[PDB]
Design a protein around this ligand. Sequence first.
Ligand SMILES: [Zn+2]
Length: 259
Amino acid sequence: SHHWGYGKHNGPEHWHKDFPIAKGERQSPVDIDTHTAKYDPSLKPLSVSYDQATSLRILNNGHSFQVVFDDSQDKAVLKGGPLDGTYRLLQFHFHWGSLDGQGSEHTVDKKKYAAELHLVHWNTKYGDVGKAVQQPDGLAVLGIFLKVGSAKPGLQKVVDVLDSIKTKGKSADFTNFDPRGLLPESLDYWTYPGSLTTPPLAECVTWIVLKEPISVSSEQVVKFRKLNFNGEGEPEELMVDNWRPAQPLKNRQIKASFK
Ligand SMILES: [Zn+2]
């Protein structure tokens, strides 16, 4: 135990000691009970504007890998849906399992998906992400489920560089990556107020979870599972099962954009 992770001695059941908000009133992820979520005709269609996105780097950050974007202008922005104002894309990352029957953070009628993609955006009215994480409407995370079947062609560029970032601290140039290639057809979604799913567990996120999963191939997710939690020179621990389980809903309402 010590610095946080996903292991027996430092995983999700330990996080509350360093981050007491772990037991807070609006923690994430949650189970999405599809029959209880209420269709809200007042919600808007989600506006996902990624045409001008500028990817920078790909990084193994010890807990996942992330692709980072230039967020110094309104290039790649999320608006509409449940959101007021404009949210800039900062990065995306994934959570995944050791086997295909677990890996997602959100669940749908208790179903776990093989993985979950998070595209993290911050509200421009707070000026920078560090300020945004201190606000209840600071961040919008677009969550997308992954199931195993056919390959996702738009993911392959990511998959093919993972061998260059095997261990914690490694990064690589990752320019000209188009995150539109990671999106499903439909933008139908569920939304609720929640939190970051990792330390610091800040209660600053409007969650937007797409109903339609993307399909990835077994070869694609196998390459995720070859990443290491450990740094180079340390005992090899596969980066798998880097997901937080569902947390209590606590009288929050999950709303559906669709009937
Ligand atoms: Zn995440």
